Amino acid sequence: MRMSSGNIGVYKLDDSRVDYELARELYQNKNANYKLGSSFVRPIVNSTTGFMGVPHFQIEDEEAQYILDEFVLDNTSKMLKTHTDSLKQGDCYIWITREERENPLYPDKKVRLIYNFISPEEVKEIILDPTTKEPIAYILESQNEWTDLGENKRKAKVKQIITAESRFVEVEGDKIEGLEEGETPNVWGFIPIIHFKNEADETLKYGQSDIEPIEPLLKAYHDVMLHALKGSKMHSTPKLKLKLTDVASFLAHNFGVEDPVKFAKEGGKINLDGHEILFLNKDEEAEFVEVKSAIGDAKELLKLLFYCIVDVSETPEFIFGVHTPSALASVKEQMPIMVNKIRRKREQFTNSWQLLARMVLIMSKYSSYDVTIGWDEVNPRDDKELAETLEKVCCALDKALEGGFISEESTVNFLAQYIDTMSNYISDDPEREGEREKIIKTKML
Amino acid sequence: MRMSSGNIGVYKLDDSRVDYELARELYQNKNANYKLGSSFVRPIVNSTTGFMGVPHFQIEDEEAQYILDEFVLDNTSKMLKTHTDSLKQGDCYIWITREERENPLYPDKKVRLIYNFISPEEVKEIILDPTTKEPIAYILESQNEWTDLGENKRKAKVKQIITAESRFVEVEGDKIEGLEEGETPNVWGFIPIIHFKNEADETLKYGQSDIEPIEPLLKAYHDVMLHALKGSKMHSTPKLKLKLTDVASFLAHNFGVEDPVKFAKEGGKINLDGHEILFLNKDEEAEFVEVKSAIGDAKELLKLLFYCIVDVSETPEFIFGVHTPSALASVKEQMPIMVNKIRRKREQFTNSWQLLARMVLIMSKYSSYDVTIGWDEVNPRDDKELAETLEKVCCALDKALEGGFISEESTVNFLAQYIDTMSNYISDDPEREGEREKIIKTKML
Amino acid sequence: MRMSSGNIGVYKLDDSRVDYELARELYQNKNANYKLGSSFVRPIVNSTTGFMGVPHFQIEDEEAQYILDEFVLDNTSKMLKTHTDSLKQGDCYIWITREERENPLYPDKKVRLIYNFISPEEVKEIILDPTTKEPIAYILESQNEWTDLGENKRKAKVKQIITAESRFVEVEGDKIEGLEEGETPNVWGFIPIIHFKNEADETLKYGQSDIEPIEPLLKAYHDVMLHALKGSKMHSTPKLKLKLTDVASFLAHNFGVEDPVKFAKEGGKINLDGHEILFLNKDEEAEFVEVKSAIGDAKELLKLLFYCIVDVSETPEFIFGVHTPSALASVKEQMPIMVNKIRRKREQFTNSWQLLARMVLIMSKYSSYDVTIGWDEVNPRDDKELAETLEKVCCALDKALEGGFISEESTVNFLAQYIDTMSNYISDDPEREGEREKIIKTKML
């Protein structure tokens, strides 16, 4: 809508959070007020997070790339889980810690970068630089209830403030050996936490869940379905009427209900085999009192709300093909819609992944610290087509030799693209196979 | 309609703003009066912004191209977010700032060009040169509420006037460490803010959201859906009538409702398991009071309004294919319509992107400062077809040699086009992969 | 939904377990309250676990690879069972033990690594290091009833505490010959148990079954189906009414029912052959009391709940194609959806499988201990296409020789990929055939 320019309030950065426990309940169909409605939450988030792969960290520096692919081999599953958490809760917080602890289970890995999650409820607040809006400190708070290695219970409410300069930790309860109370210095002058903000907005401090736009539609869908189910249970099965001359005599003779008022008050239930025959007097009657449709129109409302839901999430329509079996004829035809949605969604997190790559590189000199990110194929390109392009270009090359020597550069670039597209396996997340094949080839030589 | 030439008012540049809070509410389905109606807001904006990629800044100067692609690698996500904000709110303001601050997180990147957004509510007014209508100053006003690195709450209503000559900032509230009050000179004699005007018009000072044309249709759709839902809830389930001879005695015997009037006042509710059998006297009757259709005709109205909505947005119809599953047969057949829409939409912002490219080049000698903009493929070209064209031209060339040596120039031009279309990855936004491949090839040499 | 930042509770790691007995009951359709509803539990879990294969443990070291593939040959079935148990119960616990015991059944295999399952009910609790959340001890408790090699019955409630440094076991009941009570040292300083956490979450101590999101839908489906069946049995068959002038005389003449009241008390049942002819007086009437549809609308509700169930499980729709026979036209068209689901699901367990590979390597010097994991093809690649790509690359190579010698490295990489994809058999789980073929070739030489 339009309005006069001089009748607008002052900007303020909203800090309202997503109801994280409610979001996890809806993702698990646990909330009592969305049990029927929240069915659609799982397929939307799962399809969106599964189609978008994990970042393929690329950098020209050899050692930086080796560190990056080691880290990817360590934490690809956790990166995918980070995508899923950002999609579901709207904001997932990631913390990297350097561990020098020596245990027998890792004889060779003396130094390990632990990819640690932080639940969004743990972070009570984040302190931002007002001019840059960069987070300068994190307010973490958690009640660690745990049992001693014997049979003794331990409760410990730990709060800790992490800053770029130092980390401050205190505990209110039973002692925990792992945590050393008070300030401890930060080995680097940056905060080791990375904020993954889903659907980030310049007017919102935090992210926001993909369940939020669909949530009222889920509520309406749940209400319609529950009312429909109650109406069906009440009235779907037909109700037999008998216009008996004397109800009490009939009840006493047939069903042995000597005292019908007590039978009703007690809640007694007549038993019938189903095979019945009615011998009635001239005046009595027997009919079925039944409904054309107990539901009425609720299926049409549910279809409308389903269309609204799949529109709101802009989920491509083969995901919900049970409602519309026509969509199953060609998923490949609808693949561009998925590709578009994944294009839009990946850019939200690619900056955070760049920051994480830069941080892990810093925490382990290098000529560069800016990491470009590749991605998995949403709909794969045929290797046969790529090889056809390669052969066709190469045969096109070696003719009209006045072009220059850049033909070799372009050819090796296309060869690198082909090798990258062939090494990575499409139905396996990430590019663990590329690094593994490279390492095995290096060993065999 | 027609009108006589002498009965027209005088032109006045309208300055009404888009109701930005309402726009963000509709895009998130939050407004109470558009909950059901605003389901279509997300798919329209999301599809439109996703299909249109990010500008591909091209320029003949080597250093300018390097600076441009470095900045693209930095802020491609923010460029796409700028597109989304312009489509949603109708106007998103972009501010570039040069940060010399040294921090450990950027050891090699000492100097940074921060791509800072400004919420459209923050800019209270823009001062325009009346003869050129070029913005000569921005009136920025923002309430920055924040908390101390300890516990203290902080509130600060900072407003600042940015001009080509200098920047002025003053704060009414708690001190903010990053901001120096008073005038500060502008290192360059132009305003570092860029205005992205969605659907710009000669008679409008600001842009206008794509939600504005559809908004009344959203209101009508919401009203129809809500009234339909209420009618269904009231009357979809059938109502059982019992024409009893004595209602009070029946209630007392069956449901134990001694005082039925008080049972009505209290809101009591009879319980039925669903399996009921009716024993009635000769005179009494039982029937179901049922509706042919509680909705009536509202689905037809919803279809008409949906057609109006998709027509107004000129959205290609595979986006809303759940309503029309036949559209899913061939998205490729409808792709020219998306190509048309994106062709129309990109030109709105391409001049602003040219200005931004010029500005970032100026803020970091070059032989040229006019940057041309490429774009992502709306529907990609098949690389096999491009290779076929290349080989076919090459074999066509080297014969009938009277043409001249310009064949070599055309051949290298076609080779450059092929390298550009092959290096760029279709389902990854922007051209980060092209620059990354170029840099990796240069490093490998 | 939204909430203010200051009105959120404190994080607490929930420790609720999946009702494992109920989970196994639903998976076997045994629970009385889910008999009709739980029909969908088996196909979901079975399809999901069958499509995801078993990990293909890959590593550069020759000795490590030999140990890994020997163990795979030993326990591929148990690995698949681990996947199934994790999917069904939400958590299955795996314990590796080294058995030196000599028996005639294994003459050559003196040393064995027993892949021992632990039921999730046996582990009463797991002790976690609070700072790392790494499990530091397991509380195993199990009642072991057994009979003597003669006749005697033997009951024994054994519980045992496993830790990184040692194992403790005590038995309350009859002596078990195999178990030495008291502490026994741990040959390695890590806990030999591995936890497979299905659908792991940062806020949950344990995993969570795939039946949990669908379970209330199963309950509703069961209720609707059962009520429909009861209504049909009561009222599907028509009830013959006879408006006789004197019912008692009619019964006495026709059916010889002298005392109809006692005939009602006794539960007697008239017998009719079906071929009847009615001779009635002028005033008497005979009709059938028949329902239009005893089910009413319950099929529509069942369709809606089935759509909700398959949506919640995100199961590709060919699995339930009896409900939607159109889906059977092209399973290959829907295969990308299965590929997506398996891509998402494999990453949940791949880190645990990496840990297991590392552990078995440690329990039997090696240059590396980080094992990368391949996987079975969800939809296989056509070997003809792979051979076409190989030949096309090879013919493309050996031309334009300025590229370098890296073409040979890429060629042998592609040859290794082809050998891997050809040696492995698609419809046989795992890669036993690859190792068997390698060993047979080595023997033949």
Structure-determination technique: cryo-EM
How close does chain B come to C41, measured CA to CA in Å?
28
Q: Which of A34, A378, A8, A345 is nearest to A207 (CA)?
A: A345
| Type and span of the H or E element at C243 | strand C239-243
Q: Do C234 and B275 touch (CB under 8 A)?
A: yes
DSSP letter, residue A99: E
Q: What is the 3-state secondary structure (H, E, C) of C392-407?
A: HHHHHCCCCCCCCCHH
Closest C-alpha to B71, from B370, B368, B365, B363: B363
Strands B277-280 and A239-243: parallel
Question: Strand, helix or coil at C375?
Answer: coil
**Nearest one of C228, C211, C209 to C303, comparing CA atoms:** C228
The one-letter amino acid code at A435 reads E
Helix (H) or strand (E) holding C94: strand C91-99
Q: Which residue has the tokens 């441009």?
A: B68
* Residue C403: closest C-alpha in chain B: B445
Q: How far is CA A38 from CA A28, A403, B430, C304, in A?
A: 8, 61, 35, 13
The rounded radius of gyration (Å) of the Cα atoms in chain A is 32
Give the distance, in angstroms, between the CA of residue B204 and the centroid of all CA atoms in the same chain. 20
Cα–Cα distance between A293 and A236 in angstroms, integer? Answer: 7
Note whether C234 contacts B274, CB cutoff 8 Å.
no
Task: For chain C, say whether A39 makes contact (Cβ under 8 Å).
Answer: yes
Query: How close A342 comes to chain C (CA, Å)?
Result: 13
Q: How far is CA C234 from CA A240, A270, C261, C293, in A?
A: 10, 11, 22, 12
Sheet architecture: strand order including C156-163: C123-128, C135-143, C156-163, C166-173, C182-185
Q: CB of C227 within 8 Å of any CB in chain B?
A: yes
On the 0-12 / 13-18 / 19+ scale of CB atoms within 10 A, A235 is: buried
| Distance set, CA C211 to CA A39, B98, C22, C218 (Å) | 13, 54, 10, 9
DSSP conformational letter for A313? T
Q: Is C242 helix (H, G, I), strand (E, B) or coil?
A: strand
Residues whose CB falls within 8 Å of the CB of residue B131, separated by 6 or more in sequence, listed in order: none
Q: Yes or no: say if A72 and A431 are a contact pair by the CB < 8 Å rule.
A: yes
Report the distance separating Cα A320 and Cα C306, nearest Å. Answer: 12
A202 in contact with B at a CB cutoff of 8 Å? yes
> CA-CA distances (angstroms) from residue C216 to A28, A144, A410, C317?
11, 31, 58, 21
Q: Does the beta carbon of A269 lie under 8 angstroms from any beta carbon of chain C?
A: no
**What region, left, alpha or beta, does residue B425 occupy, with left being phi > 0 and alpha being psi -120 to 50 degrees?**
beta
Instruction: State how far the Cα of C436 lies from the Cα of C431, in Å rounded to an integer.
Output: 9
The nearest alpha carbon in chain A to C9 belongs to A121
**What is the Cα–Cα distance from A122 to B171, expressed in whole angstroms?**
33
Q: Which helix (H) or strand (E) holds B156?
A: strand B153-163
Tell me if chain A has a CB within 8 Å of the CB of C43.
Answer: no
Mutation to test the B interface, candidates A304, A305, A350, A360, most B Cβ within 10 Å? A304
C418, C386 Cβ separation under 8 angstroms: yes
Quote the distance between the C-alpha of residue B345 and its chain's center: 12
d(CA C400, CA C398): 7
Measure in Å the smallest separation between the Cα of A208 and chain B Cα atoms.
10
CA–CA separation, C93 and C138 (whole Å)? 10
B186 contacts: CB under 8 Å, gap ≥ 6: B163, B164, B165, B166, B167, B192
Q: What whole-number distance in Å separates Cα of residue C439 and Cα of residue C445?
A: 9
Contact A48, A42 (CB under 8 A): no
Distance CA B375, CA B377 (A): 7
The span from the CA of C313 to the CA of C304, in Å, is 14
B·C CB contacts under 8 A: 5
> For residue B332, which phi and psi values (nearest 5 degrees)?
-60, -35
For residue B98, give both structure tokens.
């040069």
A143 beta partners: A157
- Could you tell me how many residues make up chain C? 445
C-alpha A258/C-alpha A235 separation (Å) is 28
Distance CA C56, CA A433 (A): 11
Q: Are B233 and B269 in contact (CB under 8 A)?
A: no
CB-based contact (8 Å) between C291 and chain B? Answer: no
**Yes or no, beta carbons of A427 and C370 under 8 Å apart:** no
Going C108 to C111 to C116 to C122, the CA torsion angle's sign is: positive
Would you list the DSSP string of C169-184?
Answer: EEEEES--TTPPPEEE
- Cross-strand pairs, A146: A154
Q: Which positions in chain B touch A396 (Cβ < 8 Å)?
A: 387, 390-391, 394
Q: Quote the tokens at residue B229.
A: 């839902």
The SS3 assignment for C249 reads helix
CA distance A320 to C74: 41
Resolution of this entry, Å: 3.4
SS3 A408: helix
Tokens of B388: 């076929």
CB proximity B280 to A under 8 Å = yes
Residues 148-167 in B contacting A (C-alpha not used; CB under 8 Å): 148-149, 154, 156-157
DSSP for B271-339, please give it: ---S--EEEE-SS-EEEEE--S-SSTTHHHHHHHHHHHHHHHTT--GGGGTTT-GGGGG-HHHHHHHHH
* Residue B98 touches partner A, C-beta closer than 8 Å: no
| C378 Cβ neighbours under 8 A, 6+ residues apart | A427, C51, C52, C335, C338, C339, C342
According to DSSP, the residues that pair with B113 across neighbouring strands are B98
Single-letter amino acid code for the residue at B12: K
The kind and range of the H/E element at A193 are strand A193-197
User: Which residue on chain C is closest to A114 by alpha carbon?
Assistant: C132
Helix (H, G, I), strand (E, B) or coil at A374: strand
DSSP C204: B
Report the alpha-carbon distance of residue A239 to residue C235 in Å, rounded.
Answer: 9
**By the CB < 8 Å criterion, does C299 face chain B?**
no
Q: Which residues pair with C204 in a beta bridge?
A: C14
Nearest CA in chain C to B275: C231
Q: Do the beta carbons of residue A385 and residue B383 sit within 8 Å?
A: yes
Beta strands (DSSP E) in B310-414 are 372-374
